[PDB]
Design a binder for this molecule. Structure first.
Ligand SMILES: OC[C@H]1O[C@@H](O[C@@H]2[C@@H](CO)O[C@](O)(CO)[C@H]2O)[C@H](O)[C@@H](O)[C@H]1O
Ligand SMILES: OC[C@H]1O[C@@H](O[C@@H]2[C@@H](CO)O[C@](O)(CO)[C@H]2O)[C@H](O)[C@@H](O)[C@H]1O
Lengths: 285, 144, 277
């Protein structure tokens, strides 16, 4: 289930610190939402262990390595060595992982939150040997405040119209809070909500009571699958996604007629994957 | 005839976590327990010159030695190369105790696990050593 | 997600040996399909660890205990102590668990298969520290060959009519291979299949209600759920329509139909699943 997955790894002891890699050096650093903090998990069925390969774009063959006989950790050229393999032991109920050396499982990864780096340690009951492993997309998008633009015009955004009118349309970015949305991932459902930042409880919603109409509505409801969405990356892009609805995944968030004028309706529509169903989720500048 | 930094003879063995807890066997494990004034808390320490290492036997069972087993525990057993110990002296009476031999191609040492400095009922284990600063690997040898 | 689940624990190093407990003694023993090898996992969320409590019907308050500082594992009275809590570490490679003591997480359970008991080890790569934890129902039913009798009539059973004939009816117990079913569980589908022992690859399963046998077909998988305060009686519901329950059209006499019918609490939809004598 975890083989070949690209993930972020962050510290249970400090969830704002992430495994960070550059030029053979591994350190702990704030969220970057980029490849410096991404790792590919590579499973070997015989060892029953994983390599943890950096997604560095310059040095393409670097993997998390234990610098035996020291307690230091680095990234080195992958040679399939036993000190390049790790046991991913999931602490159930704690949603966290202890990461032990395959070469020597007496030793596990330890977060030095003051030095901001990693070492190997014997075990204990502290959060310093516990790590959070997460799909990099979820990691990047969860609790991210963004604007959403169609790729047919990146100068325009998806907005709630104002605090009292909850309809959703396409407009020129004006930096207003009605044009920002905070994404939150729900683990019980494996799907996301888009909270408009001009309200406390407003979430992007398919009005399945009115065909294809899309509006913001309160989250005060018990459970409505229409409120929740799957966000899927389009290949080769950093920030481009298709957004499908949980209730019915054949329904994709869609810009009416691929029209790019102010006022144009944002609605759901059968997934065809054309340019009008592709969305840029970005930082606000 | 003293050959080294730690004279031959009988010792009590303590963890730096407690001045009142003393190394002795309980079943096949080693642990630190309340003062007994009994021979099973007394340890004969003998230098082996050919090796530059130490053998440590219990006074109550003088042919048993501090050794280690295949499950990570320190043990009491017959003479074997697992009974050789390389101390490193870090303070008055304070030592780190390494197995003479590299284990899993690392230095391994006596290690006592603690819980906010409490070691009651813990077995003494053999775990990896990296430096002289691991509080869990520091032990006192007191002459008496 | 595992708090309060009742599970069996078996050895990756020997998958025929299960954690067994009687009168404070814990051992490794062959499959019993009973309370002696059943354990309740009790999560303390503040310690991020688990008590493992025996389902012994005679002494109800016993939990897996490390007799620190010794090498010995037993069951003692729950006093909520540190040597009675365990970290359950799922090794994502293997779908096995390492079970580490909360009192000393450097130490983990080690199956001594020769002596048929538990001891302790520091972490290593051996299968002797790996364990398979499974919901007890799954553990008992998976790869179990059984006869399936309705609560109405025990001496009768569900069967495939003949090797040539894939239909399914009710008939008296005659020990025929057409009257016996090997239950196999599929982890991906989280559901069960019933192989008939007359065929190699024939399983219990478009013509409305009727139930037959054949070589996706989500309808051919099923969910067995037990009924409270019984040993071996269960309900069986269909995967493609969980609304459906295994039904005895009548009952009770020979040849009576066995069909699909919407779930009810009635005694014609309760089935005893047993070992064939
Ligand atoms: O419900 C609104 C839909 O509008 C579609 O745009 C039409 C396509 C046909 O699908 O061709 C036009 O005639 C323009 O050439 C449009 O009327 C969009 O493709 C759908 O995504 C949807 O927005
Ligand atoms: O489709 C066959 C069903 O037969 C039902 O038995 C009927 C119940 C009503 O549900 O009452 C009778 O009239 C007898 O008093 C039966 O005709 C069973 O209850 C169902 O389980 C089902 O087998």
């Amino acid at each position: 289930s975890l083989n070949d997955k690209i993930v972020t790894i962050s510290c249970k002891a400090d969830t704002n610190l992430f495994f960070y890699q550059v030029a053979g050096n591994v350190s702990l650093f704030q969220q970057t939402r980029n490849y410096l903090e991404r790792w590919r998990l590579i499973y070997d069925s015989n060892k029953a262990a994983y390599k943890i390969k950096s997604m560095d774009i310059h040095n393409t063959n670097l993997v998390l390595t234990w610098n035996a006989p020291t307690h230091n950790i680095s990234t080195q050229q992958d040679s399939n060595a036993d000190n390049q393999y790790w046991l991913l032991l999931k602490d159930i109920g704690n949603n966290s992982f202890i990461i032990a050396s395959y070469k020597n499982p007496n030793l596990v990864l330890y977060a030095d939150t003051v030095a901001r780096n990693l070492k190997l340690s014997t075990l204990n009951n502290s959060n310093y040997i516990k790590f959070i492993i997460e799909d990099y997309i979820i990691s990047d998008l969860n609790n991210f405040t963004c604007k959403i633009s169609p790729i047919l015009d990146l100068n325009k955004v998806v907005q709630q119209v104002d605090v009292t009118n909850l309809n959703v349309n396409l407009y020129t970015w004006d930096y207003g809070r009605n044009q920002k949305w905070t994404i939150r991932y729900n683990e019980e459902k494996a799907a996301y909500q888009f909270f408009n930042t001009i309200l406390s409880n407003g979430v992007l919603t398919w009005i399945f009571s009115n065909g294809n109409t899309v509006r913001v509505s309160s989250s005060n409801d018990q459970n409505n699958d229409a409120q929740y969405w799957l966000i899927n990356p389009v290949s080769d892009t950093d920030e481009t996604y298709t957004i499908t609805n949980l209730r019915d995944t054949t329904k994709a968030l869609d810009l009416y007629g691929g029209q790019t004028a102010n006022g144009t309706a944002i609605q759901v529509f059968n997934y065809h994957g054309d340019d009008n169903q592709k969305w840029n989720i970005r930082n606000p500048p | 005839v003293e050959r080294t930094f730690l004279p031959n003879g009988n010792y009590n063995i303590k963890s730096i976590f407690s001045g009142s807890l003393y190394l002795n066997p309980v079943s096949k494990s080693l642990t630190f327990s309340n003062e007994s004034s009994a021979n099973n808390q007394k340890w004969n320490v003998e230098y082996m010159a050919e090796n530059r290492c130490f053998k440590i036997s219990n006074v109550a069972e003088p042919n048993k030695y501090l050794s280690y087993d295949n499950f990570g525990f320190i043990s009491l057993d017959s003479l074997s190369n697992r009974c050789y110990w390389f101390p490193i002296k870090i303070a008055v009476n304070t030592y780190i105790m390494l197995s003479l031999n590299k284990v899993n191609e690392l230095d391994y040492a006596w290690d006592i696990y603690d819980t906010n400095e409490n070691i009651l009922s813990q077995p003494l284990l053999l775990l990896p050593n990296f430096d002289i600063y691991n509080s869990n690997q520091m032990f006192k040898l007191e002459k008496i």
